[PDB]
Design a protein around this ligand. Structure first.
Ligand SMILES: O=C(O)CNC(=O)C(=O)O
Ligand SMILES: [Mg+2]
Ligand code: NI
Ligand SMILES: [Zn+2]
Length: 331
């Protein structure tokens, strides 16, 4: 078995290997990359996502989210308070203000220490989940707005044509902005490209050990657990590496820098934080290997998780027994 310790693998494809996305994902899996739940892909030196980032300041962040924490430094939840709209240029200035800017630090490990020590005492503002793309239309390789759609994959694998679309999302981050422990909708893959700015630190649990994280989360968030049998679908809970280590949960960590891709694999729980002002683009995707994970994915039916239009068909076709209850949670 390849990669039996479930380490995060880093790939350096040549420009020739960068042509065929599906083929390269299957290659990475042949080497065991999925066992970690997360992989890094450094694009060939010849590649670029677009020519410059000089003209992005007029993009609108219609609903910036202030991420307010509750709990203790290593075990907390966050809720998202909606703020007034602002442009990317306005948000970048905000991120660089004395109130929100990255503190002085020695290296990524020092910054990671400071994040876990101090996150809960501040409420950073995240421009998340903005439909759109920063890939130039002329970028032909690994252009996250030109991937094969998950609806087309389900149709190719299973023969059923379904409604729905699959488009990317932009994320504008600042110091301490935080993504809570989660897997993707329907335990899909994700791919994330850091277009510009400061790094993003990731934590990930191997898919084979995901249920260990879930059991710890039920212990640590006992009211939330009683409220919903899949409360990590709410995307609000954080657990630090120190707490994970104290409770014997297998995980790994890695820092993504600008110009790098990350791939999350089906049922790979992940969480993380931004080091300073940045912009990322991400989208879900599927492969044939995903279908079995889609069929087994947990679902929130309590009403909290509320997701896209396109997840309807996935539930309806892959999980017909669950469909009725899940749809009630959507409506
Ligand atoms: O970058 C972020 O805030 C969150 N991204 C992801 O969870 C992802 O790409 O799957
Ligand atoms: Mg602009
Ligand atoms: Ni994710
Ligand atoms: Zn729920």
């Amino acid at each position: 078995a390849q990669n039996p310790n479930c380490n995060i693998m880093i790939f350096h494809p040549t420009k020739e290997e960068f042509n065929d996305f599906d083929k390269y994902i299957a290659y990475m899996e042949s080497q065991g990359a999925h066992r970690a739940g997360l992989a890094k892909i450094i694009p060939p030196k010849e590649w670029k996502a677009r020519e410059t980032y000089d003209n992005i300041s007029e993009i609108l962040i219609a609903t910036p989210l202030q991420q307010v924490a509750s709990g203790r430094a290593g075990v907390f939840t966050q809720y998202h308070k909606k703020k007034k709209a602002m442009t990317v240029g306005e948000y970048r200035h905000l991120a660089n203000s004395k109130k929100y800017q990255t503190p002085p630090h020695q290296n990524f490990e020092d910054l990671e220490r400071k994040y876990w020590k101090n996150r809960i005492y501040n409420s950073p503002i995240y421009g998340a989940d903005i439909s759109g793309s920063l890939f130039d239309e002329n970028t032909k390789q690994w252009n996250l707005g030109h991937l094969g759609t998950i609806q087309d994959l389900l149709e190719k694998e299973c023969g059923v044509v379904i409604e729905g679309v699959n488009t990317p999302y932009l994320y504008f981050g600042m110091w301490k902005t935080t993504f809570a422990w989660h897997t993707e909708d329907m335990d899909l893959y994700s791919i994330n490209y850091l277009h510009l700015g400061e790094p993003k630190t990731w934590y990930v649990v191997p898919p084979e050990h995901g249920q260990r994280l879930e059991r710890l989360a039920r212990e640590l968030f006992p009211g939330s657990s009683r409220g919903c049998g899949a409360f990590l679908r709410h995307k609000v809970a954080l657990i630090s590496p120190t707490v994970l280590k104290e409770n014997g949960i297998p995980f790994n960590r890695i820092t993504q820098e600008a110009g790098e891709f990350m791939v999350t694999f089906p049922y790979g729980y992940h969480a993380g934080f931004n080091h300073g002002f940045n912009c990322a683009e991400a989208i879900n995707f599927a492969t044939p290997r995903w279908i079995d994970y889609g069929k087994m994915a947990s679902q929130c039916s309590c009403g909290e998780a509320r997701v896209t239009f396109s997840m309807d068909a996935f539930v309806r076709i892959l999980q017909p027994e669950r469909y009725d209850l899940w749809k009630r949670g959507q409506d």
